[PDB]
């Protein structure tokens, strides 16, 4: 045609990333400018994008071990 939407979700406390599709879960990486290759199922993906929420959507800097 000549045009059609796309979803635009990275607000991570508005959705349950356990709920969501795989395909929907990639695009949060895709705009991240990740993968996971070794990623077999929808919740290595979920488990990766809840580490990763604290890395690209917190106005702090994260601090670990």
Do not use: F
């Amino acid at each position: 045609g000549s045009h059609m939407k796309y979803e635009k979700t990275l607000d991570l406390a508005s959705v349950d990333l356990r709920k969501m599709r795989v395909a929907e879960l990639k695009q949060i990486l895709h705009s991240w400018g990740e993968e996971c290759r070794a990623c077999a199922e929808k919740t290595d993906y979920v488990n990766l994008i809840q580490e990763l929420a604290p890395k690209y959507a917190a106005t702090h800097p994260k601090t670990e071990l």
